[PDB]
Design an enzyme around this catalytic site. Structure first.
Site, PDB file in Angstrom:
ATOM      1  N   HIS B 133       2.366   7.082  52.728  1.00 49.16           N
ATOM      2  CA  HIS B 133       1.161   6.553  53.369  1.00 49.16           C
ATOM      3  C   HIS B 133       0.297   7.660  53.971  1.00 49.16           C
ATOM      4  O   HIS B 133       0.097   7.807  55.193  1.00 49.16           O
ATOM      5  CB  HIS B 133       1.539   5.563  54.453  1.00 49.16           C
ATOM      6  CG  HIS B 133       0.395   4.728  54.853  1.00 49.16           C
ATOM      7  ND1 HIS B 133       0.565   3.381  55.138  1.00 49.16           N
ATOM      8  CD2 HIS B 133      -0.938   4.997  54.901  1.00 49.16           C
ATOM      9  CE1 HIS B 133      -0.642   2.799  55.394  1.00 49.16           C
ATOM     10  NE2 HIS B 133      -1.552   3.786  55.296  1.00 49.16           N
ATOM     11  N   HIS B 135      -3.293   9.567  54.422  1.00 46.78           N
ATOM     12  CA  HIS B 135      -4.746   9.513  54.272  1.00 46.78           C
ATOM     13  C   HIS B 135      -5.107  11.002  54.137  1.00 46.78           C
ATOM     14  O   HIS B 135      -4.909  11.736  55.117  1.00 46.78           O
ATOM     15  CB  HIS B 135      -5.373   9.043  55.577  1.00 46.78           C
ATOM     16  CG  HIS B 135      -5.220   7.566  55.613  1.00 46.78           C
ATOM     17  ND1 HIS B 135      -6.258   6.707  55.415  1.00 46.78           N
ATOM     18  CD2 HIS B 135      -4.132   6.797  55.852  1.00 46.78           C
ATOM     19  CE1 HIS B 135      -5.839   5.431  55.553  1.00 46.78           C
ATOM     20  NE2 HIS B 135      -4.553   5.459  55.819  1.00 46.78           N
ATOM     21  N   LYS B 216      -4.405   1.450  45.940  1.00 44.19           N
ATOM     22  CA  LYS B 216      -4.252   0.870  47.258  1.00 44.19           C
ATOM     23  C   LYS B 216      -5.283  -0.275  47.262  1.00 44.19           C
ATOM     24  O   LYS B 216      -6.467  -0.092  46.949  1.00 44.19           O
ATOM     25  CB  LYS B 216      -4.768   1.913  48.263  1.00 44.19           C
ATOM     26  CG  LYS B 216      -5.014   1.389  49.651  1.00 44.19           C
ATOM     27  CD  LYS B 216      -3.671   0.968  50.228  1.00 44.19           C
ATOM     28  CE  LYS B 216      -3.804   0.532  51.717  1.00 44.19           C
ATOM     29  NZ  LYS B 216      -4.015   1.718  52.635  1.00 44.19           N
ATOM     30  N   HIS B 218      -7.008  -2.482  50.005  1.00 39.53           N
ATOM     31  CA  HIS B 218      -7.139  -2.414  51.468  1.00 39.53           C
ATOM     32  C   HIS B 218      -8.166  -3.471  51.816  1.00 39.53           C
ATOM     33  O   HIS B 218      -9.168  -3.616  51.076  1.00 39.53           O
ATOM     34  CB  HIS B 218      -7.742  -1.053  51.825  1.00 39.53           C
ATOM     35  CG  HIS B 218      -7.593  -0.777  53.284  1.00 39.53           C
ATOM     36  ND1 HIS B 218      -8.404  -1.345  54.253  1.00 39.53           N
ATOM     37  CD2 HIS B 218      -6.786   0.106  53.962  1.00 39.53           C
ATOM     38  CE1 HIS B 218      -8.032  -0.886  55.465  1.00 39.53           C
ATOM     39  NE2 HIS B 218      -7.016  -0.014  55.325  1.00 39.53           N
ATOM     40  N   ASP B 220     -10.504  -3.289  54.109  1.00 37.60           N
ATOM     41  CA  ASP B 220     -11.867  -2.747  54.363  1.00 37.60           C
ATOM     42  C   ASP B 220     -12.656  -2.687  53.072  1.00 37.60           C
ATOM     43  O   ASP B 220     -13.851  -2.551  53.151  1.00 37.60           O
ATOM     44  CB  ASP B 220     -11.887  -1.331  54.987  1.00 37.60           C
ATOM     45  CG  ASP B 220     -11.331  -1.407  56.365  1.00 37.60           C
ATOM     46  OD1 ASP B 220     -10.859  -2.499  56.815  1.00 37.60           O
ATOM     47  OD2 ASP B 220     -11.201  -0.334  56.952  1.00 37.60           O
ATOM     48  N   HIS B 245      -2.669  -3.460  52.048  1.00 34.38           N
ATOM     49  CA  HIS B 245      -2.981  -3.595  53.455  1.00 34.38           C
ATOM     50  C   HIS B 245      -3.789  -4.907  53.284  1.00 34.38           C
ATOM     51  O   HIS B 245      -4.875  -4.935  52.675  1.00 34.38           O
ATOM     52  CB  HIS B 245      -3.829  -2.414  53.897  1.00 34.38           C
ATOM     53  CG  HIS B 245      -4.491  -2.712  55.218  1.00 34.38           C
ATOM     54  ND1 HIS B 245      -4.582  -1.785  56.217  1.00 34.38           N
ATOM     55  CD2 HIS B 245      -5.125  -3.820  55.735  1.00 34.38           C
ATOM     56  CE1 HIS B 245      -5.220  -2.221  57.295  1.00 34.38           C
ATOM     57  NE2 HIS B 245      -5.567  -3.484  57.032  1.00 34.38           N
ATOM     58  N   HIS B 271       2.757  -0.831  56.450  1.00 33.08           N
ATOM     59  CA  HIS B 271       2.765  -1.315  57.836  1.00 33.08           C
ATOM     60  C   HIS B 271       3.051  -2.785  57.962  1.00 33.08           C
ATOM     61  O   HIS B 271       2.200  -3.536  58.426  1.00 33.08           O
ATOM     62  CB  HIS B 271       1.515  -0.911  58.643  1.00 33.08           C
ATOM     63  CG  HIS B 271       0.240  -1.026  57.873  1.00 33.08           C
ATOM     64  ND1 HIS B 271      -0.228  -2.243  57.378  1.00 33.08           N
ATOM     65  CD2 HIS B 271      -0.662  -0.091  57.513  1.00 33.08           C
ATOM     66  CE1 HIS B 271      -1.347  -2.040  56.717  1.00 33.08           C
ATOM     67  NE2 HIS B 271      -1.627  -0.744  56.804  1.00 33.08           N
ATOM     68  N   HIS B 319     -10.505   2.081  61.865  1.00 34.98           N
ATOM     69  CA  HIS B 319     -11.177   1.075  61.052  1.00 34.98           C
ATOM     70  C   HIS B 319     -12.717   0.865  60.929  1.00 34.98           C
ATOM     71  O   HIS B 319     -13.197   0.216  59.939  1.00 34.98           O
ATOM     72  CB  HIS B 319     -10.293  -0.180  61.093  1.00 34.98           C
ATOM     73  CG  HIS B 319      -8.912   0.071  60.503  1.00 34.98           C
ATOM     74  ND1 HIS B 319      -8.722   0.397  59.139  1.00 34.98           N
ATOM     75  CD2 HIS B 319      -7.667   0.058  61.092  1.00 34.98           C
ATOM     76  CE1 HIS B 319      -7.427   0.521  58.941  1.00 34.98           C
ATOM     77  NE2 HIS B 319      -6.763   0.319  60.084  1.00 34.98           N
ATOM     78  N   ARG B 335      -3.876  -8.511  66.408  1.00 30.70           N
ATOM     79  CA  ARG B 335      -3.232  -7.391  65.715  1.00 30.70           C
ATOM     80  C   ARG B 335      -2.043  -6.607  66.385  1.00 30.70           C
ATOM     81  O   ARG B 335      -1.076  -6.154  65.711  1.00 30.70           O
ATOM     82  CB  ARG B 335      -4.287  -6.406  65.224  1.00 30.70           C
ATOM     83  CG  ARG B 335      -4.125  -6.188  63.737  1.00 30.70           C
ATOM     84  CD  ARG B 335      -5.249  -5.389  63.136  1.00 30.70           C
ATOM     85  NE  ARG B 335      -4.884  -4.010  62.819  1.00 30.70           N
ATOM     86  CZ  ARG B 335      -5.624  -3.174  62.073  1.00 30.70           C
ATOM     87  NH1 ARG B 335      -6.760  -3.571  61.484  1.00 30.70           N
ATOM     88  NH2 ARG B 335      -5.185  -1.938  61.885  1.00 30.70           N
ATOM     89  N   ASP B 359       0.961   7.024  57.938  1.00 28.16           N
ATOM     90  CA  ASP B 359      -0.382   6.421  58.006  1.00 28.16           C
ATOM     91  C   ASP B 359      -1.188   7.613  58.666  1.00 28.16           C
ATOM     92  O   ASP B 359      -1.837   7.454  59.690  1.00 28.16           O
ATOM     93  CB  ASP B 359      -0.503   5.224  58.961  1.00 28.16           C
ATOM     94  CG  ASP B 359      -1.688   4.302  58.626  1.00 28.16           C
ATOM     95  OD1 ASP B 359      -2.578   4.694  57.851  1.00 28.16           O
ATOM     96  OD2 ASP B 359      -1.696   3.129  59.080  1.00 28.16           O
TER      97      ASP B 359
HETATM   98 NI    NI Z   1      -3.589   0.025  56.463  1.00 26.87          NI
HETATM   99 NI    NI Z   2      -3.438   3.715  56.297  1.00 27.81          NI
END
Ligand code: NI
Ligand code: NI
Ligand code: NI
Ligand code: NI
Ligand code: NI
Ligand code: NI
Lengths: 100, 566, 101, 566, 566, 100
Positions: B133, B135, B216, B218, B220, B245, B271, B319, B335, B359
């Site tokens: 994970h 980024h 991935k 996600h 977003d 995610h 996660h 985010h 959350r 992450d």
């Molecule tokens: Ni995530």
């Molecule tokens: Ni992440």
């Protein structure tokens, strides 16, 4: 000043020892890296003053006691070594069992 | 001749039945077996064993190993054993007994003129960690992860851009190609994740053919049932993994609708506890399904006193959320839940959660995957005692179960277990050497592909390597062409096929992912539990088979203030 | 003890020994100062300097290598010149010789 | 026109008969000759000499030098002369008089539009140093050595592994190949040493064909007469050098048995005084033989007040020795002897010891080869006065004798004197520029292959390069492809023949070693003395022809506290 | 639906008619136009616009951009507009409205699965700066310049050698070839200047064919009418630019004789005010001619209280001048004049001086080109009020006139405006993102060729990228092969033709200069004034059309102590 | 803080000056790099306080005397230069013959 890589590197050690000296002064028990830094920095200053290698192998055993450091820390440090420019050039000082 | 066990432990490291405490935790491992012949141990130095005609033989290079790690105490998912380790051509050659068969008995790892020696007596040797994970927010994360003991990083990103800040996605062929080129300069194995969120499959297959080994999905970028289904259909055709995610907002459905879109196909849920993202408040129920490989990201590991406080704020910055925009602030207490955060530690202890991951710089600490995994094991031992599987007075089973979470299970989930992930014959020699007092915290040596890549180093001008200041510095394995030889860039089978490596002029060794679609929860080593788990929609309490799963927050943890300057 | 100190032997050095020399009176007729370097072909200096050019032809200033003589607007002075050596080929400056002499 | 000698020294640097003190030592050099024509010196700047049609001519690039060092005071084994130095295609083109022949007399180094200028007036120029005892423990040693004035490093190792910690050996084809690849990234010339300890010659020839230019025989790998003989037979066939660290333990024989195994063949004996390793207590007698090229490693240079104290402890950490294991502690006072340590300084002064070297991070300081060599010369002048060879009121002969110990003699011993080692026409332009007050301590510019590779540099954003902080930073000669062009990787003739460079895709320029077997003590420049030397087995006193050789330890040395921050 | 302008400014950045103060100066820009459709702005994050089927469409990579900068406020020579910016294949693709045409109106920049996003709402985006007076004294200047917002560096040098200390010249084919090789390792676009001072044209054409894109004529190499004429004849034949530092000494002529040698041909005059070099005291009159492109170097920008004091000393160290040699000290007060230094600021404000540049580490600060340009604009606004061209209550015209001085005008002068210099379709995506409070001082992101190359980065191990310490660190665009793809080495047309790139094995993308001879003062964007300017030979007062041009020195400037640690 | 490479570099200079100020306070005679650091650091702080370039070219000659430094040190330092951000931007201060 024409600083060489080794002089710049020792500046890193002196600064980590400033972090430890301040904490010791607030009365905290020091951790592993803090203790190794504080004792090393003291020997570099003793070589700048012109003390001999033999004097420092001894005085370096008296900078911190077991009551000023966290548990397990004296055992994590069986010896400390540091080199500095003495009046007679670079010499290695080894302090065995510095924290008693 | 006899020697006492204590002087023996001092000279060659511990042997069968001896116990070692891991760092400053309450975990003790007990040596289960020792592959040596007492009296025939190899030791290097003036007047010692490894010398011409003695522990060193007359064989040509092809008949001896390049490197031997002597008297190592191995900790891996398969055992805690004392053995010599032989490495040849960058790979693990044998776990056994090293020496010269001309005068020694039972030699399985031959030492010759061509053999270098790393003395491992008194040290613990593990595989290098695998963080899935990542980024790619900055290149500096690779050295921070390598220093911590992680030798393989899987993730997505293009640098410090809003998209990467939020999601592990390297979008599109141009960025995928630039990041595969930049990966040759980093001292860790890398595989890249593309942007999985799209309902046109061709836009997906183009990313996979460009080189990503995974997608991935996600929220977003829109974690909708249409995008999930499309990414999984592409994944089944191209043998790549999907990381998820999920839709925290329950905008397109609730958890069971996302579980329905997945439709029993293999997927890695990131996660899984949910603070890092996912259907509120019950994404955690995903660990009950056989096709779900569930990981935790690390800020919630283990649950401690400052956990909740720190979390509300970090949600925000990651985010792209407005603390004034009340919709961008009503979902934080939906959350961040102490209930699911305390149950997550127990679920790791039972084997229902299978991987740990960072992450990195997106609610997770890239240099803390391994240390936090051990801190969770320590807190579980102190709170729940011995596991049921445990035999003996030691925690060997719990250590195997937790070391599996950042070694073999992530390599199995991502299709790269044929190359890395465990200390087994034929795999890449990515090894980490630890002194026991600093186990999990600061390693003594990190070997990438058979060359030392980074290690703690004292004064460069000193008469020995040990005088202060001692800090981690890159070694020969991290430099130029030697680094290209000792690292792997993982590609999808399609990219490898299309000659992506020759077209981008990639310089490192290439490996291909395979087996991503057939892996399931039962294949997670020591972590294959599928609990009958529920989350109360109002109170958020987690129950497994009607029993409430919970735990207490620590006020103090090991592998913390005793070791770090700041 | 001064680190790296010199101990220069006393006396003097004679510059450009064995070469023809000549003196010329120069007047700066311009309104801006003009300074001339040791090896510049004196005959091709800034035209505001008034002197006998034809005598200075193939000559440069007879002064330590790399030093200069400065002429304030209006300033008149006698300088000493030493002839060029080597092939005695003059290239550059004002583009007035561009070949041997 | 006349100018006084003092203003002349100020503008162009010293000339014939003038004297300069080297740093803060008691050594003075006197200028022996000056190649200029007074009045015709070239000087660069606004209104100066080096300008179109003046000190700069009309020639095309092929007819002029790439770089001229103006008004340099050269110090080399052949003379202390004032001259201009011309460099062309990365090599030394001429030592002579620079300028434009169209208007200047006696021009030997032509300056054109294509010529860059380094102003050397007032500075001393030497060859770059050559250190032949490097343990490749970390890549950071290359920059520390380059900053000190050393431009060529010969040694062996694979990183911070027990074998390399103890010995200069790069064992086997795989490690030799990886280290040749890593060498392209370092800004110094490099040649590698393989593991010489084996009694099967084929295991040796495989290392040489892989690329090593030499074999180290070290007692930690078994320095037995069988291994010594085998390495020397391979060396005679392949034209490579053998470096020896002999059997300190006298396990297989005494010094005369090792001398007998060698059998009159050429060999380089490392740390010949013996504290760094070798038959106790008399390895030092090896300097009497004509086929032995003897070096000292630097912690024992010169003998001072803290010397002995520091040594007992450093022995330990290097070799892999137990201070509790009394066999691993009885041999220290047999190894560390004030008697042989005090005689070693005198033996350097007489020319019986020919090279100085570091033994880097393995009882030796990689950035102190040059500084300690001058500190020994200073202590010898202060204690024994003028050498017999000396003429005049200056120490020119002693300076030539000592500068030879880290320049030409190591290049002759290792077979690379055709490329490097002295300021002579046709050799690689590896040059170091020193201001006199910092001679031997901190250089002003280090030129690798005709490009500045590292130099002291002030604030990057400043209006000039001189504002604080001024510290050494890598220059264009140390970057990427320019660095590959300005450094050499030395290979054995066999490797070069087998196309090792094309197979490993080496990017730097390659040079081949030759002449390793024919060099003997009489070939060591100014250091060819073969004394009739004895060591008393009980008292360890050293005598040369029955006269006791000894010296006094310094309490204070020059090139020490006045220059360094720590 | 309605939203107030204030909440709108908070969420999407300012729109038409809103004003922003630039850093802590008195300059305000007003948004002139906004390309969005209100309600259809794209915003990235959880639950936001850029998601599958929403603001993100179904197109394959070829039909969408690689990167979109959302809601940026562009400041360039052509306008101050709010728009989305699309980048594709490393180039600027469109300035317009981004999104998904399947559901949004007026979409010109399509966003797909392959699109990365940089959120620019609330930030200002400019082109990267172009500095044309770089002395290549050390490689560290490239990162200092990149951090300040300069993405292209034109200059000459070989490192810290006397020639380079004094002049922007890379002399000769060997040095030009080594510096083109070293340029692949630096993260900025580079073009090199050769040594223009010679009266044999062939020695010039050899440098151009080797790769330089220009020739510097400097008085330290002899700025005589013969050398000037020769360099300009070569320049007209090979389409390269000539940069001039004229004869300060008036040794070969006065300013009108140099102007006569030039003979109406295109030339770039460096440090046109004269403190950095040139005919004393009137080189400044050169800005009246149509074939002269005049730049200032930065220590004299703007005129302040300590200006004169600092200058006398810095003159010295640069040029190789003796403070004791009175000829080397009489010309300082002829060189440093408060009269021409105060007029230079006004001449910038009127558009008679067209470019700003550093003169790096040779009387100029490589990281201060952009900051000082804005400090001069601020001091001119405070002293002379609004420009005549200005419309509205804002300083938009003055901002366009000054941003042109380090962006488009230097690219036009050097023949590279086809590649870089402005935010226009088809040009290289070298972009800098600024937050308004730090505009011109410390950027938020620097994009080279479509990849982020350097940015401020907090703690590598943190849970987010923002925790302290935050300092500039190199990103993926600055690493290895990705860097080669995202930078350009500019060559002359002849070198490009002769295959110089293939012969030196250059790895970066190559671009060719063209149009150097036809550019004239009227082509300088917003800076084409040719004033009737005179300098009094005794008092040095500057007059334009008989009016005295002068200004007052600042005691305090913005973009100074509020931002910097030292 | 968004530190630029030049701000980070001056942090190196400040730290070397902390090493020198402590030694001076123990009463040692300072060496070359220690002296250059101590004087440079003093000028950077004078520019932060807002002193002018001309005032500092002068006050910088009074920080250390020949009796507080080792032999040969005043001769090894013919001038010291340092740049700092004054209220009116970066300026270079040159102190000639700082140790008398
Ligand atoms: Ni995530
Ligand atoms: Ni992440
Ligand atoms: Ni040895
Ligand atoms: Ni050694
Ligand atoms: Ni100039
Ligand atoms: Ni310049």
């Amino acid at each position: 000043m024409e600083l060489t890589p080794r002089e710049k590197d020792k500046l890193l050690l002196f600064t980590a020892a400033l972090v430890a000296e301040r904490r010791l002064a607030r009365g905290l028990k020091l951790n592993y890296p803090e203790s190794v830094a504080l004792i090393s920095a003291f020997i570099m200053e003793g070589a700048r003053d012109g003390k001999s290698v033999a004097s420092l192998m001894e005085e370096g055993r008296h900078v911190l006691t077991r009551e000023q450091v966290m548990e397990g820390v004296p055992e994590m440090i069986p010896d400390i070594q540091v080199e500095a420019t003495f009046p007679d050039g670079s010499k290695l000082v080894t302090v065995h069992n510095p924290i008693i | 001749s006899n020697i006492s066990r204590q002087a023996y432990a001092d000279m060659f490291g511990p042997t069968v039945g001896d116990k070692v405490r891991l760092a400053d935790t309450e975990l003790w491992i007990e040596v289960e077996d020792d592959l040596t012949t007492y009296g025939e141990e190899v030791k290097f130095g003036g007047g010692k064993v490894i010398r011409d005609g003695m522990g060193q033989g007359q064989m040509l290079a092809a008949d001896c190993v390049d490197l031997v790690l002597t008297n190592a105490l191995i900790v891996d998912h398969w055992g805690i054993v004392k053995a010599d380790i032989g490495v040849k051509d960058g790979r693990i050659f044998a776990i056994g007994k090293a020496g010269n068969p001309d005068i020694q008995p039972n030699v399985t790892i031959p030492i010759g003129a061509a053999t270098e020696v790393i003395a491992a007596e008194g040290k613990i040797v593990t595989a290098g960690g695998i963080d899935t994970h990542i980024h790619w927010i900055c290149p500096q994360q690779a050295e921070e992860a390598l220093v911590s003991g992680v030798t393989t990083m899987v993730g997505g990103g293009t640098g410090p851009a809003a998209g990467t800040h939020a999601t592990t996605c390297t979008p599109g062929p141009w960025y995928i190609s630039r990041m595969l080129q930049a990966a040759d300069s980093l001292p860790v194995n890398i595989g890249l994740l593309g942007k999985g969120n799209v309902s046109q499959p061709d836009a997906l297959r183009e990313q996979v053919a460009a080189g990503v080994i995974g997608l991935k999905i996600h929220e977003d970028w829109g974690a909708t049932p249409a995008a999930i289904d499309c990414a999984l259909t592409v994944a089944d055709e191209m043998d790549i993994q999907v990381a998820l995610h999920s839709d925290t907002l329950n905008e397109s459905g609730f958890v069971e609708d996302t579980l329905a879109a997945i439709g029993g196909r293999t997927i890695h849920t990131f996660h899984t506890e949910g603070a890092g993202g996912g259907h509120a408040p019950d994404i955690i129920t995903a660990c009950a399904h056989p096709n779900i490989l569930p990981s935790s990201t690390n800020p919630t590991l283990p649950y401690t006193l400052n956990t909740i406080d720190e979390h509300l704020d970090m949600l925000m910055v990651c985010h792209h959320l407005d603390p004034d925009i009340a919709e961008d602030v009503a979902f934080a207490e939906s959350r961040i839940r102490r209930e699911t955060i305390a149950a997550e530690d127990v679920l790791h202890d039972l084997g229902a959660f299978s991987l740990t991951s960072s992450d990195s710089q997106a609610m997770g600490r890239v240099g803390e995957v391994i240390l936090r995994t051990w801190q969770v094991a320590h807190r579980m031992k102190v709170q729940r005692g011995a596991l049921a599987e445990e035999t003996g007075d030691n925690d060997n089973f719990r250590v195997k179960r937790y070391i599996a979470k950042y070694t073999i299970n992530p390599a199995l989930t991502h299709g790269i277990a044929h190359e890395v992930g465990s200390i087994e014959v034929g795999k890449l020699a990515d090894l980490v050497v630890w002194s026991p007092a600093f186990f999990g915290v600061k390693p003594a040596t990190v070997i990438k592909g058979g060359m030392i890549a980074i290690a703690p180093m004292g004064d460069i001008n000193a008469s020995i390597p040990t005088p202060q200041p001692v800090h981690y510095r890159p070694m020969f394995g991290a430099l130029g062409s030697a680094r290209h030889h000792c690292r792997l860039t993982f590609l999808s089978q399609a990219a490898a096929a299309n000659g992506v490596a020759e077209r981008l002029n990639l310089r490192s060794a290439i490996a291909v992912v395979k087996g991503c679609r057939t892996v399931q929860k039962a294949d997670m080593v020591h972590n294959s539990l599928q609990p009958n788990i529920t989350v109360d929609a109002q109170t958020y309490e987690v129950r497994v088979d009607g029993e409430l799963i919970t735990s207490e927050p620590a006020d103090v943890l090991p592998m913390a203030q005793r070791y770090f300057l700041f | 003890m001064i680190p790296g100190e010199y101990h220069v032997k006393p006396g003097q050095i004679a510059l450009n020994t064995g070469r023809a020399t000549c003196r010329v009176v120069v007047e700066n007729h311009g309104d801006r100062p003009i300074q001339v370097g040791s090896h510049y072909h004196f005959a091709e200096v800034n035209p505001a300097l008034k002197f006998d050019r034809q005598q200075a032809a193939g000559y440069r200033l007879n002064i330590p290598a790399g030093t200069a003589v400065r002429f304030e607007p209006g300033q008149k002075r006698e300088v000493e010149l030493v002839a060029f050596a080597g092939h005695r080929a003059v290239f550059g400056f004002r583009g007035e010789v561009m070949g041997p002499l």
